[PDB]
Amino acid sequence: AAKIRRDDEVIVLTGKDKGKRGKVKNVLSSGKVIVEGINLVKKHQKPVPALNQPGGIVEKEAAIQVSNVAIFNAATGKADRVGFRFEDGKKVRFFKSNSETI
Amino acid sequence: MIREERLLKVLRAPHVSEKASTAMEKSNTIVLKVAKDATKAEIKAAVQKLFEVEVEVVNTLVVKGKVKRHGQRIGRRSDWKKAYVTLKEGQNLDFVGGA
């Protein structure tokens, strides 16, 4: 149920955000889903062999997995996944309404 | 039929400890830890041949282990082996040691 390749200007149907686009993603089957949609703050203790404290805490691999609408030249939504003939066949790689790739 | 001998990989890295190097002061006898089924005779050639050392006679041991990493229940053994080779003062190795 992976819905991203190298970049997916997603939205945020729910999750403290309205529709903040993003990247990274990395959604999959056994792994996570991280995008600027969310981020937080609290650094972790660093005893000093070396100051293993670069410092600065914000998002790392913030939550929010699948269930996220991807980019569309217009508004939002537009669930992808349709399927086309030939054109690789390594994946349906199409789009709802009219479009395929961004 | 060719002898299934690990002509090369019979041993592995050297042990290394307090006895290490201080043992070298004795007769340039270094340790190195070989695999279980070693047989000194298989070690002799192992070190001299290919690794250019020209040693003579060994020792070899065994040794086990046993610990407990996580909280409760989790424990084991581990085994291992020892070796000491020798290396006559004559045939050296242009020793691969330093500080």
Partner: protein, 63 residues
């Protein structure tokens, strides 16, 4: 060899990554991890490679 690249001649010669092609692994064999300089790629790609070539033998020879 690599993959299909492996199917060619019949000499066990290629099957010598152990001799003078393995001594390299021997050095970086000291635990306590000593040797962090840069691209310290001391992962076993060669031992996994010993098979394949260890295979094919029969492919041509017997089964």
């Amino acid at each position: 060899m690599k993959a299909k690249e492996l199917r060619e001649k019949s000499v066990e010669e290629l099957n010598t990554e152990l001799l003078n092609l393995l001594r390299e692994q021997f050095n970086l064999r000291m635990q306590a991890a000593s040797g962090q300089l840069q691209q310290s790629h001391l992962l076993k790609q060669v031992r996994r490679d010993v098979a394949r070539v260890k295979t094919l033998l029969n492919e041509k020879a017997g089964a």
